[PDB]
Amino acid sequence: SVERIYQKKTQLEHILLRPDTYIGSVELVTQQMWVYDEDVGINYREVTFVPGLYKIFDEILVNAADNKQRDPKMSCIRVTIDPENNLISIWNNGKGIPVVEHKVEKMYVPALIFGQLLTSSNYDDDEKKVTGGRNGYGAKLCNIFSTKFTVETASREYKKMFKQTWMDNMGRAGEMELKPFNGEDYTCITFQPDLSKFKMQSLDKDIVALMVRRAYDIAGSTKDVKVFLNGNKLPVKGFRSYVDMYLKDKLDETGNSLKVIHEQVNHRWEVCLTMSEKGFQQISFVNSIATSKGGRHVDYVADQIVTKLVDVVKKKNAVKAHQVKNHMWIFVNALIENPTFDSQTKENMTLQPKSFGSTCQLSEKFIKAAIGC
Amino acid sequence: SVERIYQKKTQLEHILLRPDTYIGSVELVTQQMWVYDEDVGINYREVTFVPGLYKIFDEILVNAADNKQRDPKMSCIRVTIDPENNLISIWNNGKGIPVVEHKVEKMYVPALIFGQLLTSSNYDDDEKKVTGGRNGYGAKLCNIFSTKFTVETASREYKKMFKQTWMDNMGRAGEMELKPFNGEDYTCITFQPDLSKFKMQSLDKDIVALMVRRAYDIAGSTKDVKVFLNGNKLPVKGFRSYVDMYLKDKLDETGNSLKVIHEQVNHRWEVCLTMSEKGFQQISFVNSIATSKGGRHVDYVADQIVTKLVDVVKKKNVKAHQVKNHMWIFVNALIENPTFDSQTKENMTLQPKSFGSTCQLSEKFIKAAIGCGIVESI
Ligand SMILES: Nc1ncnc2c1ncn2[C@@H]1O[C@H](COP(=O)(O)OP(=O)(O)NP(=O)(O)O)[C@@H](O)[C@H]1O
Numbered sequence: 030s031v032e033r034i035y036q037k038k039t040q041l042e043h044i045l046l047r048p049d050t051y052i053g054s055v056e057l058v059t060q061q062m063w064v065y066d067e068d069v070g071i072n073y074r075e076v077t078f079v080p081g082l083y084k085i086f087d088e089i090l091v092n093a094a095d096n097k098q099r100d101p102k103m104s105c106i107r108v109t110i111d112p113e114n115n116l117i118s119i120w121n122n123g124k125g126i127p128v129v130e131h132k133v134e135k136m137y138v139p140a141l142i143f144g145q146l147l148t149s150s151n152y153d154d155d156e157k158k159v160t161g162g163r164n165g166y167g168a169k170l171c172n173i174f175s176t177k178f179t180v181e182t183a184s185r186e187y188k189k190m191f192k193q194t195w196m197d198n199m200g201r202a203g204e205m206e207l208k209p210f211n212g213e214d215y216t217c218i219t220f221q222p223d224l225s226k227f228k229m230q231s232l233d234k235d236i237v238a239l240m241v242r243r244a245y246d247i248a249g250s251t252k253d254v255k256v257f258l259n260g261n262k263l264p265v266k267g268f269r270s271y272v273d274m275y276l277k278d279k280l281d282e283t284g285n286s287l288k289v290i291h292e293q294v295n296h297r298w299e300v301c302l303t304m305s306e307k308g309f310q311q312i313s314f315v316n317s318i319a320t321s322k323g324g325r326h327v328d329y330v331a332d333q334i335v336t337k338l339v340d341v342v343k344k345k346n347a348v349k350a351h352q353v354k355n356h357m358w359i360f361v362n363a364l365i366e367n368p369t370f371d372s373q374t375k376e377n378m379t380l381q382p383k384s385f386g387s388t389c390q391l392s393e394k395f396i397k398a399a400i401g402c
Numbered sequence: 403s404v405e406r407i408y409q410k411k412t413q414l415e416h417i418l419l420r421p422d423t424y425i426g427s428v429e430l431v432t433q434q435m436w437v438y439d440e441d442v443g444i445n446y447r448e449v450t451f452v453p454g455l456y457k458i459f460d461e462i463l464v465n466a467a468d469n470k471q472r473d474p475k476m477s478c479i480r481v482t483i484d485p486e487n488n489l490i491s492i493w494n495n496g497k498g499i500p501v502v503e504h505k506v507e508k509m510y511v512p513a514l515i516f517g518q519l520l521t522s523s524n525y526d527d528d529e530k531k532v533t534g535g536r537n538g539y540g541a542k543l544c545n546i547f548s549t550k551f552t553v554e555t556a557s558r559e560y561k562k563m564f565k566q567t568w569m570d571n572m573g574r575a576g577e578m579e580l581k582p583f584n585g586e587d588y589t590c591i592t593f594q595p596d597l598s599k600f601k602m603q604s605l606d607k608d609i610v611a612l613m614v615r616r617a618y619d620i621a622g623s624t625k626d627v628k629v630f631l632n633g634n635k636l637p638v639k640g641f642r643s644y645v646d647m648y649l650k651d652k653l654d655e656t657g658n659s660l661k662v663i664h665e666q667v668n669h670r671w672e673v674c675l676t677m678s679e680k681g682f683q684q685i686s687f688v689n690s691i692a693t694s695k696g697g698r699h700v701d702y703v704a705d706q707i708v709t710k711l712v713d714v715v716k717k718k719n720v721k722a723h724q725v726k727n728h729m730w731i732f733v734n735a736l737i738e739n740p741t742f743d744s745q746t747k748e749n750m751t752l753q754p755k756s757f758g759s760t761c762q763l764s765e766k767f768i769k770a771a772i773g774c775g776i777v778e779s780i
Pocket residue numbers: 088092093096121124125126142143148149150151161162163164165166167168169170216
């Protein structure tokens with residue numbers, strides 16, 4: 030019938046029906062990538078996981094990191110991953126969410142921004158923030174892909190603590206709980222991923238290894254934020270220390286230890302460069318988002334290195350750009366104003382350098398070290 | 403205030419505020435790419451354009467190509483691009499859209515699927531389809547980024563013709579026009595892009611060259627479909643002839659014409675390979691969509707070539723990326739219910755096991771490839 034063929038879907042139905050552009054694939058994929066295995070540390074290996082599950086975790090984690098920008102006093106992020114009870118919790122301190130009724134939406138702010146699509150504090154680009162949040166989907170996406178999703182946030186400013194639980198893929202909502210509060214602010218998101226939607230039995234070794242490395246990413250990309258994972262503080266202090274976990278004792282194909290060049294250009298840019306034996310490689314972050322596919326921030330840095338190096342071969346000489354890039358392994362941690370991406374998953378940052386809100390001119394010292402690695 | 407900080411947006415507001423994940427960047431981009439310049443043909447050069455504009459054109463074009471799968475009797479696609487009057491028209495024959503009132507949505511089907519977000523005939527995946535349409539956004543996105551968007555479609559089956567216009571970024575709709583019909587079905591989408599949304603004054607040389615090459619893509623990726631541009635039939639007949647327009651007079655770094663290996667594995671796969679001297683290059687299509695960032699369909703075909711060529715090299719005295727670095731591959735595939743990273747569909751993510759078909763290059767192809775210059779270069 031005509032009504033069978035031509036269908037209209039609600040926004041909520043569309044997300045569950047076509048998850049890919051929202052949270053990535055909901056099918057099990059087997060591929061190689063960086064993870065953190067216990068008793069091994071950060072290593073590159075083949076893993077079988079569901080991108081979508083890894084992503085709803087990421088959305089909540091990045092939201093926590095975003096609060097450090099909202100309130101620089103924030104100093105900690107506590108993560109809990111419990112396979113047995115299928116429970117994941119992301120806690121952060123610093124200013125909590127305003128526990129008060131939104132005068133326009135007629136409901137308490139936390140319920141609005143965690144229980145309704147297209148809600149955000151990042152819709153006014155005049156503020157030129159360097160938060161990772163941008164579309165107003167992230168948290169609701171995690172909620173929709175969870176069987177139980179709880180939001181607890183305490184606001185001393187408003188003298189109240191808010192707690193409310195959603196269930197059945199954000200299809201049901203429990204009673205909002207309000208209580209007087211006069212303590213240290215905090216926000217804790219606790220959720221039970223709907224494994225049925227990901228066709229999984231439980232949170233296995235592979236997915237956990239991915240989530241743990243992601244926690245290390247956060248500890249390495251943020252500033253003055255201690256990250257705990259199941260009670261254990263992650264031993265990371267600065268982007269440099271994080272990059273070292275990847276290189277530490279790795280040796281060159283000849284035998285010599287890989288040389289690592291580093292420079293924290295300014296308060297918004299930090300770069301590390303080493304030689305690659307498998308073509309161009311990049312590990313990048315924008316506003317604490319893991320830009321796994323890279324983007325303009327990577328090109329911007331990588332290219333000025335390439336140029337310099339090419340301008341050195343012109344002397345000892347017709348080298349192509351890609352030829353030089355193939356021997357490069359670059360790490361970049363940047364803070365970008367109002368970044369744009371190809372999709373909600375934010376794996377590729379597309380904003381033009383002219384609009385970054387800052388520049389990253391590598392030093393002569395860095396270049397000199399680069400021209401001789 | 404709390405109300406100023408925490409905001410809720412309607413779906414339509416969100417698209418205009420955050421266009422990127424819907425149609426790509428709305429800012430100018432300068433880079434080299436393949437286009438079609440008149441009196442030159444297909445060529446690779448620096449171009450300055452806005453992806454979002456190029457994309458709304460693409461959405462309507464792929465919709466036309468999709469109809470060939472819906473009605474194999476479809477035979478033509480006619481495209482008109484008039485810079486002067488900022489007008490673009492895309493016409494196709496074959497079955498028209500049912501011109502009847504939708505019993506649930508309370509409006510004629512055409513008005514529903516072109517004027518309401520999240521409307522599609524592709525929401526049921528128990529049906530294994532090879533159309534490019536997937537999310538039910540495409541047509542509405544073009545409407546939204548157009549100052550004027552007209553839909554005309556005729557269905558002999560329902561003995562009716564439908565015509566209606568939308569304006570002001572789908573914010574307003576003119577009266578619906580209905581009339582008796584009993585001729586050859588067709589659908590024509592005519593629109594005037596809202597260039598202000600793309601910070602443009604008019605459809606310049608660069609954007610036109612991209613749109614024209616895109617029309618050539620359609621002529622080369624579809625089967626049994628004649629494509630016309632501004633009244634002229636594009637001289638393409640099969641994916642092979644299409645690829646030849648890129649490799650026509652290309653030469654080696656030494657100066658000899660590059661070797662081109664071709665093969666139509668089956669009714670759903672066609673591959674062309676030659677040598678590259680500027681790193682791995684791929685030009686691919688999935689259900690007539692230009693997968694500019696590639697995807698599993700490209701990995702699938704390229705990886706088996708790499709592994710095999712990687713072997714012939716070992717028995718003659720190597721890594722993987724090193725071999726792939728000298729490959730220029732063209733892939734035209736039909737994939738069942740494909741998934742992509744974004745609405746723009748530049749990267750196809752569906753796993754090979756779910757393609758609905760296989761693509762094993764023949765021995766005649768692998769050997770002919772063994773001597774195109776790749777192995778020798780390594
Ligand atoms: N941990 C937190 N502490 C304080 N505020 C938070 C926290 N997490 C979320 N928020 C608020 O929650 C909102 C939730 O919206 P969310 O769905 O995550 O979209 P977003 O982060 O703004 N943009 P995006 O993630 O790109 O879709 C954010 O905009 C914040 O204002």
